[PDB]
Amino acid sequence: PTIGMIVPPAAGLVPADGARLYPDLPFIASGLGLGSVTPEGYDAVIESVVDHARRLQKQGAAVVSLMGTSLSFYRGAAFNAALTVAMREATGLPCTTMSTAVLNGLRALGVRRVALATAYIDDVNERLAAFLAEESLVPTGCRSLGITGVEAMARVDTATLVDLCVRAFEAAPDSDGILLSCGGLLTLDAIPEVERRLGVPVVSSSPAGFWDAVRLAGGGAKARPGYGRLFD
């Protein structure tokens, strides 16, 4: 089944990880045009998520994921759930979000005490931690990049991301795992290196969003190897 993805940037590209994780699977995307990775930014596009779900349905999507973590968690857990229900009611399709994806990935891996490694500014990190606590997880600490640019996220390099994860875990080495939050980041090369060095799993926004969307679509598809414990 074709999987549809609502993505933050105006360009509306399928996130790059899809072709690496699931080379044989069909994805399509629709772009919100988020202006900044901030609550003010989210407010300016959040009301269009339903319209974009419908746009994807009209292009043949069989399931829809809102592929933005912060767009889906910034208002708390009930809003993530309610927005999902609205997308489902509007489209008659199975729907999900990237916040649900990371929650499901952390749960699947048995992660309860979770170190946060994020691209975001602290107001957004506080909202992430509150969302996770609402959902019965225990954030242990946070290290972040403080970036508000949307398209800027793709240019953060692997070494920076590996270091970010290692520093977040260093602060709380009792953590069961690491949440690497921001679906605009290119994290696939960082993940196995972090897992190798630290011996705990990483749940990363974009890869988790794919893993979750592929689960929702129901084919049983298996990802290519080398992308982290979440994928086997």
Q: Report resolution (Å) to 1 decimal.
A: 1.5
Q: How far apart are the first and last CA of the chain?
A: 22
Distance CA 40, CA 197 (A): 37
> What DSSP letter does each residue of 180-227 carry, written as one string?
EE-TTS--TTHHHHHHHHHSS-EEEHHHHHHHHHHHHHTS---PPSSS
Q: Among residues 181, 177, 161, which one has the least CA distance to residue 169?
A: 177
Domain ranges of the chain: 1-232
Token pair belonging to 135: 């959902």
- Indicate the burial class of 14 (C-beta count within 10 angstroms; 0-12, 13-18, 19 or more): middle
Q: Among residues 73, 17, 8, which one has the least CA distance to residue 37?
A: 8
Query: Residue 153 carries which side chain, given as an amino acid letter?
Result: M
How many angstroms separate the Cα of 69 from the Cα of each of 5, 22, 45, 90?
A: 13, 21, 14, 21
Q: What CATH number does the domain located at 1-232 have? A: 3.40.50.12500
